[PDB]
Design a protein around this ligand. Sequence first.
Ligand SMILES: [Mg+2]
Lengths: 293, 49, 207, 124, 239, 279, 255, 226, 67, 221, 79
Amino acid sequence: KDIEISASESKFILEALRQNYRLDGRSFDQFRDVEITFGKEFGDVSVKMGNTKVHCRISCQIAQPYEDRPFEGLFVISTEISPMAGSQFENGNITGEDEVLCSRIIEKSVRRSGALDVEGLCIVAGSKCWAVRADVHFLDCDGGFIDASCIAVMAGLMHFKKPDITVHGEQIIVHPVNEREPVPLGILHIPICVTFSFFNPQDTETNSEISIIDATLKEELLRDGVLTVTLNKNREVVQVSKAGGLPMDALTLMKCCHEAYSIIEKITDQILQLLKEDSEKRNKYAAMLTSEN
Amino acid sequence: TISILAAPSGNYKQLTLVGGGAKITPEMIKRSLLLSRVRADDLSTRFNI
Amino acid sequence: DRRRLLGPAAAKPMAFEQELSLHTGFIENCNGSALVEARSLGHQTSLITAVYGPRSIRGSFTSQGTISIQLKNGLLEKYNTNELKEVSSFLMGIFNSVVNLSRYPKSGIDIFVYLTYDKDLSQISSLIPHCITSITLALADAGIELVDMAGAGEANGTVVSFIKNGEEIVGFWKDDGDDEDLLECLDRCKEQYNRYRDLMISCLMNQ
Amino acid sequence: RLSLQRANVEILAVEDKPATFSVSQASSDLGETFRGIIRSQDVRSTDRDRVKVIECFKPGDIVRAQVLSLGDGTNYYLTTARNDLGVVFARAANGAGGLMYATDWQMMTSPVTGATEKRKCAKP
Amino acid sequence: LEIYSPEGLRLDGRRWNELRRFESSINTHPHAADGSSYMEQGNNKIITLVKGPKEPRLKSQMDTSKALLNVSVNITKFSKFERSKSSHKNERRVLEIQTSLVRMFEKNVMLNIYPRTVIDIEIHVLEQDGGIMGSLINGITLALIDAGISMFDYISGISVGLYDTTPLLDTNSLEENAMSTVTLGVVGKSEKLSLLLVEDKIPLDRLENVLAIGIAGAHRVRDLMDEELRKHAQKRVSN
Amino acid sequence: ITITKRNGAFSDSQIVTPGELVTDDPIWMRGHGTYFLDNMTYSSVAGTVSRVNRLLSVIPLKGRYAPETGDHVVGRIAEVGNKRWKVDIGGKQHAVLMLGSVNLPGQMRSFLKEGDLLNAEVQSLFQDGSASLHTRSLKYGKLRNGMFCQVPSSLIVRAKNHTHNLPGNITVVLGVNGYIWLRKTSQMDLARDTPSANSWQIYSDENDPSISNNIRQAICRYANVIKALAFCEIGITQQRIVSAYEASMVYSNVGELIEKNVMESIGSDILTAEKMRGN
Amino acid sequence: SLSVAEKSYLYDSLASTPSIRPDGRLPHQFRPIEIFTDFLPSSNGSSRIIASDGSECIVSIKSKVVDHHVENELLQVDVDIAGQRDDALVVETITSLLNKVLKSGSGVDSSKLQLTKKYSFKIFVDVLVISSHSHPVSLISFAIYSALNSTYLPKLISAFPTFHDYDMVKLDINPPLVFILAVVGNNMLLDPAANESEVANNGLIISWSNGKITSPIRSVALNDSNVKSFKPHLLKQGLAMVEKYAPDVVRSLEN
Amino acid sequence: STFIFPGDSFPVDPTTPVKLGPGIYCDPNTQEIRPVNTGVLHVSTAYIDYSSKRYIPSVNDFVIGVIIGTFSDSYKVSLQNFSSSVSLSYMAFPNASKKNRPTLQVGDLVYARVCTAEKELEAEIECFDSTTGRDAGFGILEDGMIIDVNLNFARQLLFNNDFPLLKVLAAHTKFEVAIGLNGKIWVKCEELSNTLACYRTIMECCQKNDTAAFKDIAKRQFKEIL
Amino acid sequence: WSYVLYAKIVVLSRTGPVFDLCWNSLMYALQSVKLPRAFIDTYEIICDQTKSVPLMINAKNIAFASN
Amino acid sequence: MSVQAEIGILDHVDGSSEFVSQDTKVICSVTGPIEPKARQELPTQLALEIIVRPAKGVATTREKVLEDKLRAVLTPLITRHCYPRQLCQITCQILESGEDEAEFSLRELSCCINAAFLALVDAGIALNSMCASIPIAIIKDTSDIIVDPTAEQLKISLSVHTLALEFVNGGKVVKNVLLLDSNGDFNEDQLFSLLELGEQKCQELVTNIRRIIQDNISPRL
Amino acid sequence: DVAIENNTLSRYADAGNIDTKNNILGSNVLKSGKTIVITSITGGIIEETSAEDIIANYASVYPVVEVERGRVGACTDEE
RNA sequence: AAAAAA
Ligand SMILES: [Mg+2]
C-alpha cells in the first residue's frame, strides 16, 4: 500500500517552503515540542511530537553472553512497525528500507557510542549476564520516526532500574522489588537524533536548497534528501547518516550540526528534568504511604 | 463450537465456548459437559494404560 | 523463535530373511499414499510417502509435468538436511524417466516422503530402495501414469534402480563400500528389484 | 467477483456425457482452482449489446454454463445464452438471507421470506 | 601496538596522508556481467558485477519512467582472518550498506533514460581490511562505467580515522578498532558529499578539518581510478 | 585439457570520462553519452568523442545492442501474452512482435512459443527505445535446420544483406544484435538475390529429415571459427568467415579449434593476410 | 533455454554413431580452462577457475585448531552460488556431495592433518560460484583440487599448541576429482557443455582418487525433460572412460 | 437528544411504512430493523448519524478524487487513501468525444459526483452532474490546496448553510472553494498566504469542533501570518 | 538440574479440528515417559544408556479432549 | 472494577481506542473498509485482519492464540455482508501486561476485546449488537469468584476465566455468549456460579461502556 | 472410534533390547477415523540457578505440531 | 502496452 499525493499538494507545499512557510506553522530550524510521560512501571515511557505518538518499554532477562565477548553484556532493539501507525505499513516487515534504517541509527547511537555500559551488565564472565531489550511501539505516524524513537529509548533506559543480583558460588539469585531497590543502568552520555529533510524547488535555478528539521508525514514524502545527525551535551558527534539524496556541501553538513546542537541540548535538559520530577514523585509517594502505617 | 477437557475425577480443565451462528442455551452446556464426561471416562480406561 | 515453541535456548539436548509390509491409499488428504515397512537382520525401516497432484499451475507454459520430491524426518533426527536434499535430487532424476510427463502439461506433481521410524542395531543408502518403492506405489495409487515400475536394491552401499525388468537403469548411487563390486552389486540389486517389483504389483491388485 | 464488462468465476464440476458430474477437487483458499470468465455478451442471446451484469449474476451464486473457447492457459470463456444455462443455486443478499428458487428466466424468488432478486435463471 | 609513531609513521609505515596500495581493474569478467570491476585497495579485494540495463524478471517490478537499481553485497566468510560461522546475508549491517549504496547511485546514474529496465549490481568481497565501505563505492563506480551505463559523475569512497588530534587517511581494520572512522562519498572533483557515515564517537570541535582531508583524499582516489580507466581506454582504442 | 597457472596475482580520438567537459561550445547538438548543463557539455560515459556534423556525442567503450530501424536481427521468444510477442534480441528491453507483424496462413502458442528462435527486421522504434519486430518477408521467419551461437554485438556491422551463403552447403545469419544462426542451405537460400534481378511449414518445429554429417560438421566448424574471430575481437564479415573456415582446414580434427593458441592463430592469419594484400 | 528445433538438432547429432559435438570436441576432450592460485593472503589457500562458457568458481582454504577426538569431520566444505539461496536445492545438494567427496574416511587421508596426539588441523573449504551455466560439481572440484595443492599453514614447533611465527607448512595431499559425464543415446561424453546437457538422456557423476575410481558415484539427471533409462553397458563404459583419461587431466592440472 | 446503540430495539412502530436509509440495516432473513451504528437517530425519513473518517461510495454524492491511473477504458481515481479505486469514464466529461480523449494526468484533482455505486461492484463517478447546468464547479481543480477532515465536518459544510465557516472565511478573504463528501476540502485563493491561512483554520476547527469558535480561530490565524 | 520435555506431533489425513486429537495423543504419550538418569565424573552432563525412571504425573488431573 | 477509556486518540487511523483496566493497558486501532489484498478477498462477506502485539518482545504463538480468540468475538459482531470484498485492519497493541504475561494471558485478552469493540464503534462499522468482556478468577483457598482481579490475585488463583457476552435491547437482554475461556481446575457448580456473577458484572460494564460512547460521539455531532 | 499404539516408537519399547541411537523418551500413535496422529517425546537437561498447588509449581512441555496439508513453507497459524 | 493529421 502507498500514500496517494495530489499534484496540487506537491506544488503547494514546495512553493510554501520557498516562502519560508509550512503546514504545521513551524520554522526551518525549529523542532517539534516533545512531551514525555512515564507509566506506572519503571522503563515504560511515552513520547509525543505533535501528532506523532510512540511508545517504549524496557525489559531484562538472565541470559548468556556471546563467546566472542564474554566480558560484555547483551543489548537489542525492536523497531517493528504495526499497521496501527497507518495502513501504509505492512504487518511483520523487517525488510523495510526506512524501517531497518531507524533501527540501525538508534543502535549506533546506543552501542557503538558507549552510551550504555554493557560491561556493567555482565554478571559472570563467560557464563551469565543481563540482556536488556528495548521494544519501540509506533502508535501514530505523522513522521519523525528516527527522532521520536531516539528519545523514547534513551529516556527509557535512564528510567529503567534492573533488580539487584548477588552472586552465590555458581548460583545466580534474584532479589524481589519489595526487599531491595532495583539498581539503575549506567549511562555515560545521552545521544539524541535530529532528522533533516532537503528540498530542491524549480524556478527561483543556479543555487537553491531548502532544509527543514523534523518534517511531518506530508513533508517527508516530498523531500529529495534525508539526513540524520546524533549529538549530545558532551560537544561531540555520536553518529551521522547520509545516504545519497540531494548532494550537499560539507559546510551545509556542519551547518546542520550547529542547528541540531541547540535542539538536542534543550531536550536533554528536559529529559533529565522529567527524570528528576518523576524520581521525586515516587519518593514523596513512598513517604506518604509509610506515614499512614 | 464447544471445547471441553474433562477428567475422570469429575472436574474440568479447559472450557472454550464460542457462539457465532446460534444462541447457546445453558441446557446445551449441561448436555455438552455430560457427553464430555463419558467421552473422557472412556478414553481414560480403554487400552489399560 | 517466534514461529514455534523451541523452549529454553540455554538448555542442551539429550547426550548418551527380507520382510516387507505394504499398504496404500490410507490417506484421504492427498491423491495417493503409501506405507512401506521393511525388517531385516537388526535393521528395520518404516516410511510414508504422500503424493499431491497433478494440480494445475496458473500461467504455466510447460508442455510436460513437474515433479518435486522432499524427504522429512518424522521422529528421529538423524539425517542432515543437506543429505535429504541430495537424495531428493537423486529420486527426481529417477521418476522423471518413470513418470509419463507428456500426460500432464501445465501441471505439477508434489511428492512428500516422511521418514518415520528407522532402527539400526553408508547409512541412508539402505533406505533409498524403500523410498523408491514407496513413491512408485504412491504414484501408481494416485493415478499418475508410469512408463514402468521403479524399484531398487542396496548392496554394500551401492544402490542401483532398475526398470523394464532389470534390463535398464534409472538411477545409480555409490557411496563408500569397496571396488570391483560393479558386476556383483548389479546382480544382487537386480534380484532385490524383481522381488520388490512383484510385491508392489501384488500390493496394487489385492486391495 | 463481479466487474462491469464481464464476470469471472471458478470451475467446480463438469457435466459428463450420456445426470452425472465430475467434481474437480481443489483448494478454494489458494487459487489453484481453475478460473473462468463469462463475457457480458455471452450472458443471454436476448439483447447481446446492452446487458446489466449486476442484475444477472451475484457473488456466491452458482452458475451453470457451457465453455466456448479455452483461450489462454489462465481463464476459460463460458456462456449462459441458452435456456438450460444460468444461475442455479443462490441465496438472498449475497448468501445472507434464505434459499431462493428459479421461476422466470430473468427472475428468481424465495418462497420463505418473500424476497425477490433479479438473476439469470435456467430452465427446470 | 603502536598505531601512530611520533616520527609520523604507522603500522605499515604509511604517513597520515598516504593511501594504501591502489589498483583498479576494468572488464575483468566480460563473460559474467555487462560491466565488471576488481577493486584492489590495500588488502581489500572486491569483485563487482553490473548486469543491465535489462528486462526485469517479473512484471511485479517495473518502472515506466526510471530504472530499477538493486545492490547485493555478498560478504564472504573467508574475508577476515577469522571465519564467521554465520552468513552475513541477512544481517542488519549488510541490509544497511546495500540500501545506502542504492540511494547513492540512484541520483548519480541516469535511470530516466533507461525506462522499464533493471540494473543489477552483485558484489563479492573476497577480503576486507578496513575502509570496506569506501572500497565498495569504488567498486560500483568503475563497474557501472564499464557496463556503459550513463551517470553524471564519479563517486569516490574513502575512510578517515581520527587518533587523538591527528587524523588518518585510508584506515585498516586494526586502526578502525583503535579509533573512530568517517567514511565519505564524493561526487566528482566537487566539495559535495554523496555519502556521509560516522559510527563511533567524534568531537564536534574537530570535524571540518576531518572532512576536508577526506574530500581531498577521495579526490586522489578519483584520479587513480581516472588514470587506470583512461589507461585501459587507450589500449583497446589502439586496436 | 588446457590450463594456465599464474601465481601471486588475480582528426584525433579524444578519450573522455564521466564528469569531464568535452567542449564549451553550445552550438553542437547534444547526442548520446552527453548531458546539458548551463551551456556546457559534459560526458556521461567513458569513451571516444564523436563529432559528426552538428551532432555531438560520446561513444562508449562497451554497451548493449542498440536497435535501429532496418536492422536484421535474430531473436528468441521470451514470453507470449494477449495479442503480442515479446522477443529477446539481447538489447536493453524485449522487442515486441505484434500479431499483425507476422504471416498468417490458411492460440498463438501453436505458431510461436517461448524458446523459439527467429530472424526479423526492426519495423519501428518506441519512445523508450524498444524495437518493433517485423517478420513479413520471404527472408524472415522461424529458424531451424542448424545451431545458435552468440558473439558481441559490436563485432557485426550493418549491411545490405546479412544472410550469406557459404561453401559447405550451410548458411549464416549475421544479426546486428550479435545473435548468429548457422543452418543448412535451403531452396530460398540458394536463389534469393538472383531471382530478384531475373505456407504452414514456415512455423514448423521439426528440422529437415535428412541432415548429412558433411553439413553437421560444417555447421560445427563454422561455429568454432566465428567464436574464434570473436575471441580476438575481430569484426565478423562474410569474408572473414570464409577465410577463417579455410584457414582452419589445416587442422584435421574440428575439436582442436577450441584452444586459445589455435583461435588466436586463425585470427592473426586473417589480420596479416588482409594487411599484406591490402597494401 | 533452447528451442525444440535446436534440441532436436543437437540430439540427432550427439546420438549418431560418429557423434558430432556442437564445438567439435571428441567424447574425451576437455574445454580449455584457466586456474589462478594463492591470491588471498588472509587465507591459507585460494583458487579461481574460468571456463569456456564463462563459468567461474572461487575456492578459499582456511584452517584452525581443535581436538580430533571430539571432531570426526576435520574437513568442512561450504558452497555459496551467486544469485542462489543457502537453503536452495542445488546448493545443499552440492554442499552434501562435496563433503562426501572430501571426507576423512573417503578420499582424504586423516593422518596428513595430524600434528599431535591431542590437537590437529581442521580445514575449512569455502566455495563461491560467480557464474554457472551448467553443473558446477566438476568445476568446483577442479578448483578445490588446485586450492589444496597450494596451501600454507602455521608450522609446528613441538611434537607428541605452539606455531612458527614466520616459516610455514605446505600441505601435500592428493585431493579427489569429480568428473561429470553425459549419457546421450548410446554414447558417453566427458565435460558436458551447457547446451549438451539440456538434450542428454542421462548423466553420471564419477569421483577419482589415487589413480583409481572411488566414491561418491551418482547418476544425475542433467535436465528434466529428455531423461530416459540407460543400459548397464553405458555405466561400465563411462567408468572405464574416466579411468583412462584421468591421468591426462591430473597431469595437466599438476603443472 | 436521543442516543442510539447497535442491537437496541427500534422505537419506530413497524405498523406505519417507513423508508430506510444509512445507519439502519434490514435483516435479509428475520426482516427486523436494527441500528448498526452509534449516534443520533433523525426521524422526519429514517437514518442514523455516526462519526466516521472513512468514506463509502454512494449515489448523488459530491466527491474530490485524485487520478492514480490512466487506462484506455476509463480513469482510475482514488477518493481516499487505501480505499478501492473508482471508475471515471472518458464520456463522463462535458463536451465528450469518441477518438479525442479529455486531458487529465496522474495526480490531477477532479471534482465529480458519484453516479452508480454498488456494494459489490466498482463505483463510478462523472465530471458532470445529472444535471445542474453542467457546472457546479465540476472539472479539474487547478493549483490550490486540499485538506483531510472527518465526514461529519464535510457534509455539514456542504449541505447546511447555517454553518459559520464559509460565512466567516468570506469576510477574512475572497476565494473559491469546493467541498467533497469524502472528507476532502479544496480551497484556492490569489496569494499563497491566504490559502495557508484557510488551511490552518479548518485544521483547528475540525480538531476542536465548536460552532462558536470559528470566528475566534479565524481572527488569530489571519493575523499570525502578518 | 531439571528435565525439559520436548514434543513433536505429526498429523496425517486431516479432516476437521485436530487439536482434540493432538491433545489425546499427547496425553497417552505423557502417560508413558521414562527419564534416563544422569551422571558426571564448566562440566558437561552425561545420560545413562540403560538405567531410567518412569515419569510421575498426576493421574487425577489427566484430562481428555472432545469437540 | 473501576476502568477508564478514550475514543479517537489516533489521527491517521479510521477508528481507534485506548482501554485501561487495573494495570493492563491495551490500545487498539481500526482501519476500514479499505482495499483488501488478493489473498484476503471474500466475494460475499467482509475480511478481518487481526493483529495483537505484546508489551515486551515480539509477537509469538501466544499472541497468535490471542488473535484467534479475538477473531471469534469480533466476527459475529460485524455485519460482514454490508461490505462485500473489502478489508478491516484491527490492530491491538498491549502497552502494559498488568499481570504475569508468562503464566496468564486471559487478563490481556479481555482488554483486547474491549478496546477492539470501542474502535469498531469509532471507525463507524456495521455492528449487529454490542459486547463486553471481563476477566474472572477463582482462588484455591477462598474458593470465591472474583470479577476483574489483580496481578497478585492470579498468582495464588486455582483457575482463570474469560467471559464475553453479546448485548441487545438497551444493553440488557443477552443474545448469545460470544466467548467463554477457562483454564485451571474447576467443577460444574463453579461454572454456572461464574455466569451468575459474570452476566451481572458484564451488564455493569456494558452500561458503563455505553455512557463512554455518548460523552465522546455526541460532541462530534 | 479411537485406536492407539503406545510406546512403539520409544527406545524403551523393548525391555531386553534397548535402542542406543533412539532419543525418544515416550511415544504414541493415534488414529481417530481418517486422521492419524504420531507423537514423539524427547528430552533435555538444563542447569537451574535461581531463588502446594499453584501456577508457579506446575510446568508444561513444548510441543511442535506439524499438520501436513501437502504445502511447503513456514508453519501455518493452525500449527 | 491506447497514441498523431483530415
Ligand atoms: Mg548464495
